[PDB]
Symmetry: C4
Subunit: 302 residues, 4 copies
């Protein structure tokens, strides 16, 4: 029937990306910047934050502040962020930053640092909250606001979007806005593709993200006990994709959070994966906007 | 008393299967095909899907679409399925496909591919949902429909059944239908056996399945952190059974899901287990319908 | 105040057990036999079983049968039990069986086998259910019944007790009954001790059990991914205790369940631990009734 | 806006601690002493304890005693505590004890032992309960009481505080009391810092604690399967911090609980980490009050 999902996509025939330097794989390291934008009555929310912290079994507290939860988030913005940024600078690997606009407003100096470092600032929404149930009017308003904030902060408007906890209208509103080159609000492929259902009809690129090669699993019910578990997980993902890349190259995202991989216990394994990746020839270490411009120039929208 | 369960089965005296090629073990690799058939208001369900995805702590959403959940499922049908099918083709190992009829209707080309590859299409029900509470009338109707769909799709009716989340009537309805050679809706033995309580009185073979040597544990609360955990789990299962097989051969199922082992990070470990298994002599790599026909010819129903 | 718990016990001065053969450690392997006695409307319960199976996130179903859950339990009594019993017979290690009386009634042949093998049959209660909220009258009645059943089944009354999910009266009722040598309904020490609060005033020995060196963790939210995790856990427990045993020997329990360690994937690691343990001199492999009689003869109740 | 959190802290410019012996890292091993102070109707609570035990999926029981839960806690005070104290004595490493005042009242002999051993007794609150919702009046009263108890018990008032499950007023009340040198009710940095918002205006030192390099994860939903997982986690944390310490030394806390790392299976890995740490030059093994006095003398409050 007139089924609004594409279960098929490229089928058994995915396109060759032709990554620069004849790369057998494209690696997109992504650093989320959410600290200061999460759930909090201080921010006008009805409850405290519970998602993604050391407090693995936390529940949101209605009309309350959860001090421990707040403090675990402050680790991300106070200490984790700088240690991570230094690590990427040390191996000369660029980042795409998934920056929440309210978080960035609260820490403009680190955002400025990131931009000066040459990292791409991608929009991660106005607030770090669940958009599942929000009215279309308000989600659109948050969106246009996130754009305003990041443009002023950065001096350049965001060209990609990623909400994460999206609702039924999130991605439609992104493509309707007009000014995005891409979005990342899918986990459906190993390659970019042109959105098949853009009402706008303009080319809109989808660059799928990840929930599995993602440090969020360090704090979820099912998830890595020690750093080496995340290293072996990342390593396996690389090995299979790199092997496929001998004839059919693909991409791999690596999701990271300041308050999570920022802890020394977890950073070690990220550095190990980076050294592993760097030891291979034909790896394209890149930003998602660069993948997007590359797609345009290589596989233009027909 | 007149207890409707058989807690005893074969007791301390299990039969020798006499697998072809004097195999010390029979390996049944199974690939579930559920993507497109899962919970969704689009499919007429009251809520979204929450079982078996990267969103380890998901809950069903009433009257809502969960876009992320949908997208994680689309990974299975868009990308995972082809990579898995290639892996099995590369080692010349046949599959039994646990194909959900609605999922197959949404992707007939992949089903046709599987059949052309020589994989057995086993019925996994009309829909991928919990049958626990469904009225007998409707479950029977789903069943006869699943049969209709797969016969047209495949050109041959399904000879095995597996629902998974069965209710008190599921298995009785399967045996009452008449045309199945076997079912897999048990986790009670290491060997096939004839159903002791078939009202039909015709021979009905039970080929027990698994929830432990099953990639579903990658996304459950208790479950594998990294691929090597699933490899060592599978390897241990093999080692003990193979050792028993010197005098008393048995079988082992390996359950797989497109949207799960389809991810590169997880495929590596499956390939490692396959290489391990292949390095042993006297291993029978087979389909469940072949086990069933073998049982008939070897241990006829008395 | 008049605090009904002993937080202190032996303090920094635990007694030397003087295990036979000058053992530096006493190992108590325990095999639970619960299959056939668990929650089930068939057994007169209000709901199905959910504790300790592959269905890691199961909930009890009110007025329903959970067929999968039943089938996972049937694995324990049909297949797991024999494989485990063979393993212990192969290394000549004796068991204490934690036998639920209703489970034993449903499978008398395996109970008879265990007794003929020389394993101790310890009482694990009439039913495998939570006694937390049961009235004293009914719990006492279950208890006297469990005794009746096992005596007839075995030809000798049970000399130890272990309920597991006890209520505020469980242990008091056990000691009031009179005929038990010991109970195991604590997790409070590394050595046996005489119950300090027996109203009876007769000597009653407490032999603490375990929830950590216990295969139940294979199916709990926090718990072993692969067999080697349970092997390394057991190995570490052994190493520290054995080292302490150079001057101050203690004991270690290893809890096992037919439907859990009975799976080949998990048995491998148990066999590895047994081989490790066996490779050490001065290890006392024993039954809990033997520890109890030893305590009597070695550290009589003053 | 006038946002009551400091998301920024030291920014990219953390101070050099100048640890004694030119240490590249400061290690604070912490032993919680909570057993006897946890939730219990015996203690006047409305429900039993459920946090941090082998009963990984426990829920609090209203108006009930949970005997197993109690017994698992008694392991901590009866057996775990002495084994842990011996381990630290063997490597000549000092502890900071996070002692709950009610727990200490129930076991004065072990507290006296700890003090005689030269370990610092830090206040962990009057009771081991959640202060999230307690009225300010009662939390203040608990606090002044915890102080009274520990001073009498120890012969010296506590100079640090740590509640853990704090409410919106906990830390403010601590600094208002006047007599504390520091608190540990944050998880926001890798270095001590002066509280920027002390109403008192006196210098108050914050020495951040941890929920990740903490044996509590052995019994949480996401957490270590085997001891080596905690060893590798601790080792990684050390390696990254020690490497940073070549130019910019920091500190690392290691949280421990008697009833958890007290089990032999878990102690092994703690001993392994201690041997690893000890094998490095320039490691400062210290107590938190010593870090605090050092901070005063080295980075006085301006």
């Amino acid at each position: 029937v007139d089924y609004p999902r594409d279960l098929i996509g490229y089928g058994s025939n995915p396109p060759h990306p032709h990554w620069p330097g004849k790369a057998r794989i494209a690696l997109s390291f992504v650093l989320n910047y959410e600290e200061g934008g999460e759930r909090n009555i201080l921010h006008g929310d009805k409850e405290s934050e519970a998602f993604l912290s050391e407090m693995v079994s936390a529940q949101p507290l209605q009309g309350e502040r959860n001090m421990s939860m707040e403090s675990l988030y402050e680790y991300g913005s106070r200490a984790g962020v700088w240690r991570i940024l230094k690590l990427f600078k040390a191996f000369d690997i660029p980042l795409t930053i998934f920056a929440v606009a309210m978080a960035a407003q609260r820490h403009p100096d680190v955002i400025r640092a990131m931009v000066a470092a040459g990292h791409e600032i991608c929009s991660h929404g106005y607030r770090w909250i669940d958009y599942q149930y929000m009215d279309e009017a308000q989600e659109r308003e948050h969106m246009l606001e996130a754009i305003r904030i990041l443009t002023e902060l950065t001096g350049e408007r965001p060209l990609g979007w990623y909400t994460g906890r999206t609702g039924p209208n999130t991605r439609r509103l992104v493509m309707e806005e007009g000014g995005f080159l891409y979005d990342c609000d899918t986990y459906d492929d190993d390659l970019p593709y042109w959105e098949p259902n853009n009402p706008t009809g303009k080319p809109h690129l989808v660059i799928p993200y990840t929930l599995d090669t993602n440090d969020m699993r360090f704090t979820q019910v099912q998830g890595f006990n020690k750093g080496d578990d995340f290293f072996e997980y990342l390593k396996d993902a690389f090995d299979v994709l790199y092997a496929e890349g001998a004839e059919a190259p693909k991409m791999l995202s690596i999701g990271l959070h300041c308050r999570l991989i920022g802890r020394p216990a977890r950073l070690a394994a990220l550095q190990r994966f980076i050294e592993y990746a760097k030891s291979h020839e034909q790896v394209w270490f890149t930003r998602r906007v660069d993948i997007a411009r590359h797609w345009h120039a290589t596989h233009p929208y027909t």
